[PDB]
Amino acid sequence: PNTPWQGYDINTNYYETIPQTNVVREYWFDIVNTTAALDGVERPVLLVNGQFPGPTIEANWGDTVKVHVTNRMENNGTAIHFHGIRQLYNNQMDGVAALTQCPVPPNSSYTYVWRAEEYGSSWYHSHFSLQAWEGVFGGILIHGPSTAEYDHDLGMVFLNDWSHQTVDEMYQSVLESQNPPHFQTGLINGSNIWVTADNQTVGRRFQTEFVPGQRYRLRLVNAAMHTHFRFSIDNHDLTVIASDFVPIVPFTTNNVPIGMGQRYDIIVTANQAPDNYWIRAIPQSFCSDNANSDNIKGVLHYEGAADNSDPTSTKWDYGDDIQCLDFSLDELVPWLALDADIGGAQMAESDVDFTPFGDVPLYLWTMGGNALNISWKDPTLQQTFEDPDKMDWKASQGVIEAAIPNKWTVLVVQTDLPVPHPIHLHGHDFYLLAQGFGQFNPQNVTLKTHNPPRRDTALMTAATPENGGGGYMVIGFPADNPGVWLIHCHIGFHATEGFAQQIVERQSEFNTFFSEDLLENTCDAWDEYAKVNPYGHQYRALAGPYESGI
Ligand SMILES: *[C@@H]1O[C@H](CO)[C@@H](O[C@@H]2O[C@H](CO)[C@@H](O[C@@H]3O[C@H](CO[C@H]4O[C@H](CO)[C@@H](O)[C@H](O)[C@@H]4O)[C@@H](O)[C@H](O)[C@@H]3O)[C@H](O)[C@H]2NC(C)=O)[C@H](O)[C@H]1NC(C)=O
Ligand SMILES: *[C@@H]1O[C@H](CO)[C@@H](O[C@@H]2O[C@H](CO)[C@@H](O)[C@H](O)[C@H]2NC(C)=O)[C@H](O)[C@H]1NC(C)=O
Ligand SMILES: [Cl-]
Ligand SMILES: [Cu+2]
Ligand SMILES: [Cu+2]
Ligand SMILES: [Cu+2]
Ligand SMILES: [Cu+2]
Ligand SMILES: [K+]
Ligand SMILES: [Zn+2]
Ligand SMILES: [Zn+2]
Ligand SMILES: [Zn+2]
Ligand SMILES: [Zn+2]
Ligand SMILES: [Zn+2]
Ligand SMILES: [Zn+2]
Numbered sequence: 001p002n003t004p005w006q007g008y009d010i011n012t013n014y015y016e017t018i019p020q021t022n023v024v025r026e027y028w029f030d031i032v033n034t035t036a037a038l039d040g041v042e043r044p045v046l047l048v049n050g051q052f053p054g055p056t057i058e059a060n061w062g063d064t065v066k067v068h069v070t071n072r073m074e075n076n077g078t079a080i081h082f083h084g085i086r087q088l089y090n091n092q093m094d095g096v097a098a099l100t101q102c103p104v105p106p107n108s109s110y111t112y113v114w115r116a117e118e119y120g121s122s123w124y125h126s127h128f129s130l131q132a133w134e135g136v137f138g139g140i141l142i143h144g145p146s147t148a149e150y151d152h153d154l155g156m157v158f159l160n161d162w163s164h165q166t167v168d169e170m171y172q173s174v175l176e177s178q179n180p181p182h183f184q185t186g187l188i189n190g191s192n193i194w195v196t197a198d199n200q201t202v203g204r205r206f207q208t209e210f211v212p213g214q215r216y217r218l219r220l221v222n223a224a225m226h227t228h229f230r231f232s233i234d235n236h237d238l239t240v241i242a243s244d245f246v247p248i249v250p251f252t253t254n255n256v257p258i259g260m261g262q263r264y265d266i267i268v269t270a271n272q273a274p275d276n277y278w279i280r281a282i283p284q285s286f287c288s289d290n291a292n293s294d295n296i297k298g299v300l301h302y303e304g305a306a307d308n309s310d311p312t313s314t315k316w317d318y319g320d321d322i323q324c325l326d327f328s329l330d331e332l333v334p335w336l337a338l339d340a341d342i343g344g345a346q347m348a349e350s351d352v353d354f355t356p357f358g359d360v361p362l363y364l365w366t367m368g369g370n371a372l373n374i375s376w377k378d379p380t381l382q383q384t385f386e387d388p389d390k391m392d393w394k395a396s397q398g399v400i401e402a403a404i405p406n407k408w409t410v411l412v413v414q415t416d417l418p419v420p421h422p423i424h425l426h427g428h429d430f431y432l433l434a435q436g437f438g439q440f441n442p443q444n445v446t447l448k449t450h451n452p453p454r455r456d457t458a459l460m461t462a463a464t465p466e467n468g469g470g471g472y473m474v475i476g477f478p479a480d481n482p483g484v485w486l487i488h489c490h491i492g493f494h495a496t497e498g499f500a501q502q503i504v505e506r507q508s509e510f511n512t513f514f515s516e517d518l519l520e521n522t523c524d525a526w527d528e529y530a531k532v533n534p535y536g537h538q539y540r541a542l543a544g545p546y547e548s549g550i
């Protein structure tokens, strides 16, 4: 109705129908090695063109988006994933090193061409080792229909945990120990204050200004390394209007529990007394180890000033900030109602465990029997191009086949440990059938199949040690998208340690998107770089910084 998607609305099946705008958006990203003082302490970061939040990819529903990525670092390769982007018959643009491409080496490039076949909020980031968490990420905002109206779109709001030592600096101590990583702090959209060792304050807090009476869209993204956050705005109400790329029936709440890799679209109404209010992102202590959960805040400033002054507002009393949880299954109802259709589906189960390896012990996460051990130098797609009808997978490849077109897969991702994990499926919106605590008993647990929640990242929740630990999440998806899709824990360190598996989906029909050149050119350049730079060689052993390959 005077929109760039005229002739479609909130009720259009975006899995089947894509607006043809014939418009190409085009971005040039130089991935750089540098330095940044995000809370006023200097430390190394790796960045998209020098900015933290990387610049945002903006598109309208239905557009083609073309991201020219160039590696201008000296000691990392790169590969860039557009999280939540479906890549329908476009697998090779999904940017998972060791699956869909070789890593792009310094001074080489890779042009990502993908279609905007969803609308909503997400982000792109590296899928190359720990790099997304060095800062190689930025938002994706695809304009489209909304399930509630608002007045102003404030864009992305990123929530990270943060340390003054590098995620790569801490990696080796993470692997050699069974306790979680420790983070000093957090940032909201890349800012926070910081104070130590003098009582001097450095950096600054996030701030936005609401004009009274106005309705704002905020698009939350948990971009953190190892934190599940609960987000709120003192005295204000939040109207959840979408989960990941899927718009839901609006509903209000005090706080948004937000898992790593997840997005929530939020409408907030300047309907409180024009004053100053805490914006809070609080680490959930069951699965978050932060030194500063009280102090990851930002200022909501109402136009009717009170400038330069802190807020004095009280946090919503909503219970503890302990357990790491998703909105419940019934709270997340997709506006496009589609259901799970699991009749006669390939049933599958994957255990999640945390096991030691080698004489040092390195403690590795392990998904469906093995910790992933694949090869930058030899991505799956090369394997399947060299051998079209390959069936001899190696267990440490974490293959789960779905070779029959349009057949569903109902997967159980389950654990015995009192440790919860965000689980993200590439190439798909999965249908979230069950979610719970303790062990999963297919007789006692009732699968929601009628218009269940639909998204790309959801928690495998876990019970606390006093309640016996353990947990499971159940997902289902049709084989509707040929390609090799990573399925994995969205926690950085876990996925690098092997907490990842690969859907080898519709293998026969890889020729439907596969380009020899797009593959070879990059792999040759990466091979070229490995001959001269020690960092071109994937460390895969057990006395150093292990990389599963993704
Ligand atoms: C968190 O950080 C993000 C990145 O640092 C912030 O992203 C910004 O989000 C807003 C909301 O979508 C965008 O606003 C738009 O800007 C584009 C481009 O604007 C520029 O070019 C036009 C001409 O094409 C010019 O007229 C403008 O003055 C600008 O020079 C517009 O086309 C859109 O219609 C819209 O106005 C920003 O572009 C976006 N920036 C980046 C770098 O992605 C985000 O705001 C931060 N979140 C909060 C809450 O602060
Ligand atoms: C970013 O730049 C830094 C500084 O040049 C790189 O780190 C150094 O790495 C070399 C090679 O391993 C070492 O010999 C130096 O001692 C390091 N110096 C410091 C200050 O750490 C780093 O590898 C680069 N990162 C990339 C290319 O992604
Ligand atoms: Cl842990
Ligand atoms: Cu992601
Ligand atoms: Cu993804
Ligand atoms: Cu995990
Ligand atoms: Cu991923
Ligand atoms: K070679
Ligand atoms: Zn819009
Ligand atoms: Zn961990
Ligand atoms: Zn004014
Ligand atoms: Zn003011
Ligand atoms: Zn059916
Ligand atoms: Zn063969």
Ligand SMILES: [Zn+2]
Pocket: 339, 449, 450, 451
């Ligand atoms: Zn139904």
Ligand SMILES: [Zn+2]
Pocket: 524, 525, 528
């Ligand atoms: Zn060559």
